[PDB]
Homo-oligomer: A and B are copies of this chain.
């Protein structure tokens, strides 16, 4: 369909307005003949489709008196219709100029020129301005640019051809249609009488300058020069002229480009006027020994050989134009394959860009697009050596913001190495001040990170705009689900940090202090280091949020608290890969491979812990008990449990930290029986034990009874005394009145119900407490004791109510002794057997679902077959469901079946009354073959395959339950269970500190700054040692060595081909010298 609306850019350059196609293209005019001066408005514009081309290039016929800024606005409106309003702006205008006739090149120089032009068009997104015809230099530029059109997706570089209308074949066919011509076919083989030069088929745009003449060339040179000057004025881009062969008109074009300030790159080895300009640049600028023999008379003889003028004054004017074209050494850049190299054409384009109109930040942006960091490093060292460090440091902010924009982390490390603070970032546009003080306290680097979030969110199919639109949060970061603050400042970094704290966990939170960024704290020691740490953490969280791995590695390496930030990263990238805001096919591989990158951070985090376990176990235990102040004073193993990293929690150094968090961090009593002997005799063991006056022994006893192992063995001893005293209650006979042991059981389970209600209501929440298995077993033993005690206490004198009370309390016996198995998770040899039994219970339920078929079928058939003449009752159903079971487990009741069958023979099934009654054996025979030889041994094979499947996963789940049991018993009350309600009375004393008295005094231990600086230097030394060892291990792999020697063979084969070409040139010079 033809487009009726086009987005034309405004005169301010900050917006685009939709208009009609005829109303925008009425400013483009045309001339029907040479006598017409004002002419008609143009009716020949639209889309022309070439043969063997999938797309139709837009053509526009414009007048010679029309302005080139309207043609550049029409090209920008065509690019806005092609690739949306957020199209790629060009950074280079490559003016391909040279011979309009056919010019055969050597294949090494044409391959190097086409590879440099394709690499500059792929990297810089450059606009190619050529002649547009399919003959010679413009056809070679179209053959260079057609390889970039197929190998690169998304936005393509446009190849604009500016050509005269009267020489273009098919312009009368282009002028014979109602505009816009949507896909009109261009016939290059059509015989046009007055125009014989067809257009190039690989040119992606056409500008046909119409002065009304026919078969005239050179009428569109000044219009293409004004279009290149208008594009360099509009996009703030340098214009570079590529020159290959060429005539005297190309020499006058290069002389007018050198007079206009445009730098020109001449490719030597292309012959003609380009070799004459290369010989003039060799005689005028090059002091080499091959260029020492070049003379003005030899260059005049080469100009008479190539151009061949009719007069000697024209040869003197051509030699003067070749001298004045190569008079400026900055404006002429000579590229040779025998001098520069094969991969030096884009370096010659970058050298012409550095030798162009020189802004320093635009040269660093063009070097960051061209990706030659040694060129920008030598230019920054030359700018620092010339005393221009203030102009370098003024332009390093926008170059560094473009370096995080275009994702070049070696340039990020280059600008970070060139004396620039990472907390000295300022945005490109000014931020409007809101009435909220949280945005008023945000510094300029937070506005720079919010500018990079708004720049990354302006791309189409962006996952961050779908992340914000599915966030349902406020601009302060609260999830309560003003609109100008929700449109302009919606990507503020406090709201992003609250979305990241929600995206790690439900209870995860971060803490950022901007009050060290004031100028009054500049004299504080280490405030600049904490400023670089907070800015590296914010740019680190932005680097995960843009999923760039190497920039996140660089901000992880220059940041502090590396292990905690790597765990938080790996959790938020592994959860953000499997998220509904990243659903969609176009964000497919960024779904996948970033999850791959997420596993990379998990492996990275383990190795820094391994580097800590390479260095010192005691410094690693001092590392992992340190509470980071940016994450609400949480230790790193709680960050691992909230981050759910099972690979980090199964490490033995983390298990050394968790077993140091057991036993009160006391290195004397570590055995179970030694802790039981210390708990049974406290006064006779704890002075005699090793350490961690009377106040020191009281502090040692207070360190002993605040251990989680001591509270765990107190809860185990209280549960053992509970189960033994309820065993002595339920086995002994209940009296006619209420006994004192029933009052002790009532007070004991009343304290257990008060501790269960204190764990349910005031501690965690109802949905967290209902998800636990053992809390539900505790609730059903509370309900079983209260049902049996209400059945006893409804009628204490009835013996039948005592029978109902013991039959209700047998469930309490079975569930209480089964709840004694929940203390076996602290043992090393019992806990994975419990997790393997809980994995194996699905195979148990599969065996029950297999055996119920055989049991119900043989039970109904067997009980119907031994009793033919019997009415149905309950006892027939008990006779179905009873005996078959116990015939699986071994008691094959047989005499009782011979007595039930009423068979009177001396043989055990003979002389029976019913003749069909001696088939109960045969059904019993096939039942015990189906049960005791088929299904139970299928369990055996299912348990062997089940245990050999999930043994290591049961071990890693035991490590997660080990830190979950240590965190559960660290927050346990210090008293055991029948004292615990009295300890809840002490919690009621905390209620006396809460609201009425309000005299609560609490404090926390503050660590030393020297110990935290030693832990941070230990973290930086272990992280640098692990990244050096991991780079050596990545370089020491087999695949990297065979790929490195394959690239070195390919470079040695290129060096051998260059040495063979230099030896062939030396043999040709030795043949021509003779």
* B1049 and A1045 form a contact (CB under 8 A): yes
A1041 CB to nearest chain B CB (Å)? 5
Cβ of A1073 under 8 Å from chain B: yes
* A1058 and B1060 form a contact (CB under 8 A): yes
Q: Bound state CA distance, A1069 and B1068, in angstroms? A: 11
Cβ of A523 under 8 Å from chain B: no
> Count of chain A residues with Cβ under 8 Å from any Cβ of B?
35
* B1042 and A1041 form a contact (CB under 8 A): yes
B residues less than 8 Å from A1059 (CB atoms): 1056, 1059-1060, 1063
Cβ of A1051 under 8 Å from chain B: yes
Contacts A1042-B1038, A1063-B1063 given: A289-B1053 contact, CB under 8 Å? no
* A1065 and B1062 form a contact (CB under 8 A): no
Cβ of A483 under 8 Å from chain B: no
* B1063 and A1052 form a contact (CB under 8 A): no
* A1065 and B1067 form a contact (CB under 8 A): yes
B residues less than 8 Å from A1051 (CB atoms): 1053
Question: Which listed residue, B1041, B1063, B1066, B1072, touches A1046 by the CB 8 Å rule?
Answer: B1041
Cβ of A189 under 8 Å from chain B: no
B residues less than 8 Å from A1074 (CB atoms): 293, 1073
* A1070 and B1066 form a contact (CB under 8 A): yes
Contacts A289-B1071, A1045-B1045, A1046-B1041 given: A1062-B1062 contact, CB under 8 Å? no
A1044 CB to nearest chain B CB (Å)? 7
Residues of chain A from 744 to 773 with CB closer than 8 A to chain B in the complex: none
Cβ of A1057 under 8 Å from chain B: yes
Against B, the Cβ 8 Å flags (1 = close, 0 = not) of A274-294 are 000000000000000110010
* B1038 and A1068 form a contact (CB under 8 A): no
Contacts A1043-B1041, A1045-B1046 given: A1056-B1057 contact, CB under 8 Å? no
B residues less than 8 Å from A827 (CB atoms): none
Against B, the Cβ 8 Å flags (1 = close, 0 = not) of A437-448 are 000000000000
Cβ of A628 under 8 Å from chain B: no
* B1043 and A1052 form a contact (CB under 8 A): no
* B1044 and A1052 form a contact (CB under 8 A): no
B residues less than 8 Å from A1052 (CB atoms): 1049, 1052-1053, 1056
B residues less than 8 Å from A1073 (CB atoms): 1070, 1074
A292 CB to nearest chain B CB (Å)? 8
Q: Bound state CA distance, A1057 and B1062, in angstroms? A: 13
Cβ of A717 under 8 Å from chain B: no
B residues less than 8 Å from A1067 (CB atoms): 1062, 1065-1066, 1069
B residues less than 8 Å from A1041 (CB atoms): 1042-1043, 1046
B residues less than 8 Å from A1072 (CB atoms): 289
Cβ of A2 under 8 Å from chain B: no
Cβ of A486 under 8 Å from chain B: no
Cβ of A1050 under 8 Å from chain B: yes
B residues less than 8 Å from A1043 (CB atoms): 1041
A1040 CB to nearest chain B CB (Å)? 10
Q: Bound state CA distance, A1048 and B1056, in angstroms? A: 12
Closest to A1052 in B: B1053
A1034 CB to nearest chain B CB (Å)? 15
Q: Bound state CA distance, A1070 and B1069, in angstroms? A: 8
Cβ of A830 under 8 Å from chain B: no
Contacts A1063-B1062, A1063-B1063, A1067-B1069 given: A1055-B1056 contact, CB under 8 Å? yes
Against B, the Cβ 8 Å flags (1 = close, 0 = not) of A24-51 are 0000000000000000000000000000
B residues less than 8 Å from A721 (CB atoms): none
* B1071 and A1069 form a contact (CB under 8 A): yes
B residues less than 8 Å from A1050 (CB atoms): 1048
Against B, the Cβ 8 Å flags (1 = close, 0 = not) of A716-739 are 000000000000000000000000
Cβ of A1064 under 8 Å from chain B: yes
Q: Among A1041, A1056, A1064, A1072, which residue has the most Cβ atoms of chain B within 10 A? A: A1056
B residues less than 8 Å from A1069 (CB atoms): 1067, 1070-1071
A1059 CB to nearest chain B CB (Å)? 5
Closest to A1065 in B: B1067
B residues less than 8 Å from A1064 (CB atoms): 1062
Q: Bound state CA distance, A1066 and B1072, in angstroms? A: 13
Question: Which listed residue, B293, B1062, B1068, touches A1060 by the CB 8 Å rule?
Answer: B1062
* B1046 and A1048 form a contact (CB under 8 A): yes
Closest to A1071 in B: B290
Closest to A1067 in B: B1066
Q: Bound state CA distance, A1073 and B1074, in angstroms? A: 8
A290 CB to nearest chain B CB (Å)? 5
Against B, the Cβ 8 Å flags (1 = close, 0 = not) of A562-582 are 000000000000000000000
B residues less than 8 Å from A1045 (CB atoms): 1042, 1045-1046, 1049
* B1068 and A1070 form a contact (CB under 8 A): no
* B1063 and A1053 form a contact (CB under 8 A): no
Q: Bound state CA distance, A1050 and B1052, in angstroms? A: 9
Question: Which listed residue, B290, B1057, B1058, B1063, touches A1066 by the CB 8 Å rule?
Answer: B1063
B residues less than 8 Å from A1038 (CB atoms): 1042
A1035 CB to nearest chain B CB (Å)? 11
Q: Bound state CA distance, A1062 and B1062, in angstroms? A: 11
Against B, the Cβ 8 Å flags (1 = close, 0 = not) of A1026-1045 are 00000000000010011111
Closest to A1072 in B: B289
B residues less than 8 Å from A1062 (CB atoms): 1060, 1063-1064, 1067
Closest to A1073 in B: B1074
B residues less than 8 Å from A290 (CB atoms): 1068, 1071
B residues less than 8 Å from A289 (CB atoms): 1068, 1071-1072
Q: Bound state CA distance, A1058 and B1055, in angstroms? A: 11
Q: Among A1048, A1062, A1067, which residue has the most Cβ atoms of chain B within 10 A? A: A1067
B residues less than 8 Å from A293 (CB atoms): 1071, 1074
Closest to A1068 in B: B289
Q: Bound state CA distance, A1067 and B1048, in angstroms? A: 26
B residues less than 8 Å from A1048 (CB atoms): 1046, 1049-1050, 1053
B residues less than 8 Å from A1053 (CB atoms): 1048, 1051-1052, 1055
B residues less than 8 Å from A1058 (CB atoms): 1060
A1064 CB to nearest chain B CB (Å)? 6
A1046 CB to nearest chain B CB (Å)? 4
Contacts A1048-B1050, A1064-B1062 given: A1057-B1055 contact, CB under 8 Å? yes
Against B, the Cβ 8 Å flags (1 = close, 0 = not) of A513-529 are 00000000000000000
B residues less than 8 Å from A1057 (CB atoms): 1055
Against B, the Cβ 8 Å flags (1 = close, 0 = not) of A282-311 are 000000011001000000000000000000
Closest to A1057 in B: B1055
B residues less than 8 Å from A1042 (CB atoms): 1038, 1041-1042, 1045
B residues less than 8 Å from A1055 (CB atoms): 1053, 1056-1057, 1060
A1062 CB to nearest chain B CB (Å)? 6
A1037 CB to nearest chain B CB (Å)? 11
B residues less than 8 Å from A1063 (CB atoms): 1059, 1062-1063, 1066
Q: Bound state CA distance, A1055 and B1061, in angstroms? A: 11
Q: Bound state CA distance, A1050 and B1067, in angstroms? A: 25
Q: Bound state CA distance, A1051 and B1074, in angstroms? A: 33
Q: Bound state CA distance, A1045 and B1048, in angstroms? A: 10
A1058 CB to nearest chain B CB (Å)? 7
- Enumerate the 5 nearest inter-chain pairs by beta-carbon distance, A residue then B residue, closest first: A1045-B1046, A1066-B1067, A1059-B1060, A1052-B1053, A1048-B1049
> What are 13 of the A-B contact pairs (CB < 8 Å)?
A289-B1068, A289-B1071, A290-B1071, A1042-B1045, A1048-B1049, A1052-B1053, A1053-B1055, A1055-B1057, A1059-B1059, A1062-B1063, A1063-B1063, A1067-B1069, A1070-B1070
Q: A interface vs B, CB < 8 Å?
A: 289-290, 293, 1038, 1041-1046, 1048-1053, 1055-1060, 1062-1074
A1056-B1056, A1062-B1063, A1069-B1070 given; name 10 further pairs at CB < 8 Å. A293-B1071, A293-B1074, A1038-B1042, A1041-B1046, A1042-B1042, A1049-B1052, A1052-B1053, A1059-B1060, A1062-B1064, A1066-B1070
